[PDB]
Design a protein around this motif. Structure first.
Motif, PDB file in Angstrom:
ATOM      1  N   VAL A   1      33.314  44.178  47.974  1.00  0.00           N
ATOM      2  CA  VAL A   1      34.622  44.156  48.627  1.00  0.00           C
ATOM      3  C   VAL A   1      34.885  45.477  49.335  1.00  0.00           C
ATOM      4  CG1 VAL A   1      37.115  44.206  48.237  1.00  0.00           C
ATOM      5  CG2 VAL A   1      35.738  42.454  47.148  1.00  0.00           C
TER       6      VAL A   1
ATOM      7  N   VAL B   1      37.996  35.508  33.841  1.00  0.00           N
ATOM      8  CA  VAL B   1      37.093  35.106  32.768  1.00  0.00           C
ATOM      9  C   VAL B   1      36.739  36.299  31.879  1.00  0.00           C
ATOM     10  CG1 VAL B   1      34.913  35.440  34.009  1.00  0.00           C
ATOM     11  CG2 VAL B   1      35.061  33.735  32.187  1.00  0.00           C
TER      12      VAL B   1
ATOM     13  N   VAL C   1      28.997  38.646  33.031  1.00  0.00           N
ATOM     14  CA  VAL C   1      30.218  38.629  33.826  1.00  0.00           C
ATOM     15  C   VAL C   1      30.547  40.023  34.351  1.00  0.00           C
ATOM     16  CG1 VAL C   1      32.692  38.158  33.804  1.00  0.00           C
ATOM     17  CG2 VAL C   1      31.124  36.675  32.561  1.00  0.00           C
TER      18      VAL C   1
ATOM     19  N   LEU D   1      36.188  36.471  38.443  1.00  0.00           N
ATOM     20  CA  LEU D   1      35.472  37.211  37.415  1.00  0.00           C
ATOM     21  C   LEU D   1      36.351  38.116  36.549  1.00  0.00           C
ATOM     22  CD1 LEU D   1      32.270  37.747  39.504  1.00  0.00           C
ATOM     23  CD2 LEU D   1      32.314  36.900  37.130  1.00  0.00           C
TER      24      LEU D   1
ATOM     25  N   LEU E   1      31.012  41.025  38.205  1.00  0.00           N
ATOM     26  CA  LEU E   1      32.287  41.606  38.608  1.00  0.00           C
ATOM     27  C   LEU E   1      32.129  42.945  39.321  1.00  0.00           C
ATOM     28  CD1 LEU E   1      35.291  41.933  38.721  1.00  0.00           C
ATOM     29  CD2 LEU E   1      35.252  42.756  36.353  1.00  0.00           C
TER      30      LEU E   1
ATOM     31  N   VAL F   1      32.686  30.478  30.761  1.00  0.00           N
ATOM     32  CA  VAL F   1      31.876  31.109  31.792  1.00  0.00           C
ATOM     33  C   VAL F   1      31.313  30.032  32.711  1.00  0.00           C
ATOM     34  CG1 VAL F   1      29.869  32.526  32.275  1.00  0.00           C
ATOM     35  CG2 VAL F   1      31.330  33.033  30.302  1.00  0.00           C
TER      36      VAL F   1
ATOM     37  N   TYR G   1      35.327  35.796  50.611  1.00  0.00           N
ATOM     38  CA  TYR G   1      34.487  35.227  49.566  1.00  0.00           C
ATOM     39  C   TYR G   1      34.425  36.142  48.352  1.00  0.00           C
ATOM     40  CZ  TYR G   1      29.984  34.799  47.090  1.00  0.00           C
ATOM     41  OH  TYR G   1      28.980  34.735  46.149  1.00  0.00           O
ATOM     42  N   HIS G   2      34.042  37.392  48.578  1.00  0.00           N
ATOM     43  CA  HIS G   2      33.918  38.349  47.495  1.00  0.00           C
ATOM     44  C   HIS G   2      35.244  38.665  46.829  1.00  0.00           C
ATOM     45  CE1 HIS G   2      29.657  39.207  47.745  1.00  0.00           C
ATOM     46  NE2 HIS G   2      29.747  39.323  49.056  1.00  0.00           N
ATOM     47  N   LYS G   3      36.318  38.683  47.614  1.00  0.00           N
ATOM     48  CA  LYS G   3      37.640  38.954  47.060  1.00  0.00           C
ATOM     49  C   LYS G   3      37.923  37.912  45.982  1.00  0.00           C
ATOM     50  CE  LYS G   3      40.487  41.470  48.960  1.00  0.00           C
ATOM     51  NZ  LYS G   3      40.882  41.399  50.398  1.00  0.00           N
TER      52      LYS G   3
ATOM     53  N   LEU H   1      23.956  26.642  37.376  1.00  0.00           N
ATOM     54  CA  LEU H   1      24.081  27.530  36.220  1.00  0.00           C
ATOM     55  C   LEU H   1      25.283  27.043  35.398  1.00  0.00           C
ATOM     56  CD1 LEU H   1      23.535  30.075  34.552  1.00  0.00           C
ATOM     57  CD2 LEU H   1      24.815  31.372  36.237  1.00  0.00           C
TER      58      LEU H   1
ATOM     59  N   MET I   1      31.566  29.957  36.743  1.00  0.00           N
ATOM     60  CA  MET I   1      30.398  29.789  37.613  1.00  0.00           C
ATOM     61  C   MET I   1      30.626  28.639  38.587  1.00  0.00           C
ATOM     62  SD  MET I   1      28.298  32.220  36.793  1.00  0.00           S
ATOM     63  CE  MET I   1      29.830  33.099  36.519  1.00  0.00           C
TER      64      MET I   1
ATOM     65  N   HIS J   1      30.571  42.248  42.896  1.00  0.00           N
ATOM     66  CA  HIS J   1      31.542  41.746  43.852  1.00  0.00           C
ATOM     67  C   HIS J   1      32.621  42.775  44.210  1.00  0.00           C
ATOM     68  CE1 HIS J   1      30.023  37.656  44.201  1.00  0.00           C
ATOM     69  NE2 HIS J   1      29.839  37.637  42.893  1.00  0.00           N
TER      70      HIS J   1
ATOM     71  N   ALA K   1      23.459  27.347  43.620  1.00  0.00           N
ATOM     72  CA  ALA K   1      22.801  27.805  42.399  1.00  0.00           C
ATOM     73  C   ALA K   1      23.842  28.039  41.300  1.00  0.00           C
ATOM     74  CB  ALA K   1      21.993  29.089  42.669  1.00  0.00           C
TER      75      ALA K   1
ATOM     76  N   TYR L   1      19.654  31.691  40.101  1.00  0.00           N
ATOM     77  CA  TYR L   1      20.900  32.020  40.778  1.00  0.00           C
ATOM     78  C   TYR L   1      20.758  33.400  41.425  1.00  0.00           C
ATOM     79  CZ  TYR L   1      25.200  34.875  40.423  1.00  0.00           C
ATOM     80  OH  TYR L   1      26.193  35.819  40.573  1.00  0.00           O
TER      81      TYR L   1
ATOM     82  N   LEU M   1      32.930  29.951  41.164  1.00  0.00           N
ATOM     83  CA  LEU M   1      32.219  30.815  42.101  1.00  0.00           C
ATOM     84  C   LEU M   1      31.483  29.918  43.094  1.00  0.00           C
ATOM     85  CD1 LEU M   1      30.722  33.608  39.789  1.00  0.00           C
ATOM     86  CD2 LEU M   1      32.412  33.880  41.607  1.00  0.00           C
TER      87      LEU M   1
ATOM     88  N   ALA N   1      35.709  36.129  44.369  1.00  0.00           N
ATOM     89  CA  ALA N   1      34.732  36.189  43.290  1.00  0.00           C
ATOM     90  C   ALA N   1      35.293  37.161  42.260  1.00  0.00           C
ATOM     91  CB  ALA N   1      33.370  36.691  43.815  1.00  0.00           C
ATOM     92  N   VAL N   2      35.929  38.218  42.763  1.00  0.00           N
ATOM     93  CA  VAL N   2      36.532  39.236  41.913  1.00  0.00           C
ATOM     94  C   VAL N   2      37.670  38.644  41.074  1.00  0.00           C
ATOM     95  CG1 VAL N   2      37.888  41.367  41.891  1.00  0.00           C
ATOM     96  CG2 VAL N   2      35.906  41.183  43.388  1.00  0.00           C
TER      97      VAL N   2
ATOM     98  N   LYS O   1      18.296  29.255  34.837  1.00  0.00           N
ATOM     99  CA  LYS O   1      19.250  29.003  35.917  1.00  0.00           C
ATOM    100  C   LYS O   1      19.856  30.301  36.419  1.00  0.00           C
ATOM    101  CE  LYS O   1      18.551  24.670  35.653  1.00  0.00           C
ATOM    102  NZ  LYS O   1      17.764  24.048  36.750  1.00  0.00           N
TER     103      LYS O   1
END
Ligand code: CA
Lengths: 231, 224
Positions: free
Chosen positions: B207, A220, B196, A217, B200, A97, A209-211, A73, A101, B203, A69, B47, A104, A213-214, B43
């Motif tokens: 963590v 950006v 964002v 994010l 952030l 952004v 995964y989340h680490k 996006l 995405m 996530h 997804a 998502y 991500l 993503a941080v 979208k």
């Protein structure tokens, strides 16, 4: 006081030890059944958690050969970011952004693939093979134990006295069963901890995964704060 | 008839065409922004909730159903083994992730999607219509002026003044619109920034939750 040795053997194979051995075997077959149903449902809920979208999920179980997804996006933002132009800040901002995405999206791909291989597949094997074979064995042994117990009683009823040589054979067999149950118990103790290990594989995969993503994010985020400030 | 010719070159010449173009450009930017917001909003929603049957509101979070399954079996196994309690530990971790996901959906909905929907249904639609209007009015006067010039050759100084005044009004209206869109432009970037920020925070909270459960299983396996 008559048929002394026969009564002692009857006292065990059909007494306390006997019942305890029967419960032990029953106890283990229960834990296996629970483990089996558990692993199956947790496997299904995990897949649905990774890909709530049924179309993409069906493809996950195939293994990625499907779009995330996040990627969809990303595409939307990048497409319109281009159409807007660089004569403004929203246009280029959608590109920054949109890129994130897509980034991500890639880490999400890794999460799906890792959980699929280090968690889902292992449990599928545990369920379809190992647990299935152990279950049948417990039942098979549980039946024999019950059979020899009945044959012994019925025999004691007929003959009254059972020769000493046949008694020890009955004791040897009963003993062989006690060993089989004990060997299964320990085998299960090891499986039990291996199951906790599989759970780690899942958790570790999410954390990583989340680490990421941080990191993606946070970055950006800077790009945007600066862009706004420098409009 | 110099005077009349100077006005005609302004309104029916280069400066006129420049203003006309300025109006058409903003119109373009509005159309594109309008369509972009709709698509991006859609979208984003897909998502947040990939499962179509559960996009209505934007059912329980996938994380929540997983937590359920682990806790149930976690307790059906018992506290004698290690897997039963382990499932309990990870199960609780999933529920906490379900809490954070809930927040994500709520904060993205409130600081990104709705603002965009509002912008698309109100602001962008009003500006678009206003731009159409001034555009037609602008052309209407350019023509009226041109036919007045053809009809009488020399146009009275006072009528020339009115022509210049109306042209100035539109010229300023376009200058106003330009800035209004500048405001919006940076506003929209702020919305992306809000999107964002929400992700952030989500996530980050994920963590921490996972680091905890990681240590608990790390230890449990060690004491096994
Ligand atoms: Ca002026």
């Amino acid at each position: 006081q008559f048929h002394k040795a026969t009564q002692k053997v009857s006292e065990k194979v059909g007494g306390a030890e006997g019942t305890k051995l029967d419960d032990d075997f029953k106890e283990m077959e229960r834990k296996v059944d629970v483990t089996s149903r558990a692993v199956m449902e947790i496997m299904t809920k995990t897949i649905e958690y990774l890909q709530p979208n049924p179309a993409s999920r069906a493809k996950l179980s195939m293994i990625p050969g499907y779009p995330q997804a996040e990627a969809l996006l990303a595409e939307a933002m990048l497409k319109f970011g281009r159409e807007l132009g660089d004569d403004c800040n929203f246009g280029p901002a959608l590109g920054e952004v949109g890129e994130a995405m897509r980034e991500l999206s890639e880490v999400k791909d890794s999460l799906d693939i890792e959980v699929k291989q280090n968690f889902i597949d292992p449990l599928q094997n545990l369920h379809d093979k190992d647990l299935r074979e152990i279950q049948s064995a417990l039942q098979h042994h549980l039946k024999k134990l019950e059979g020899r117990r009945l044959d012994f009683d019925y025999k004691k009823k007929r003959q009254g006295k059972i020769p000493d040589e046949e008694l020890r054979q009955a004791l040897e067999k009963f003993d062989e069963s006690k060993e089989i149950a004990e060997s299964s118990m320990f085998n299960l103790l090891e499986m039990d901890i291996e199951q906790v290990s599989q759970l780690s594989a899942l958790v570790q995969a999410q954390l990583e995964y989340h680490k990421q993503a941080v990191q993606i994010l946070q970055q950006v985020t800077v790009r945007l704060e600066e862009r706004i400030r420098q409009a």
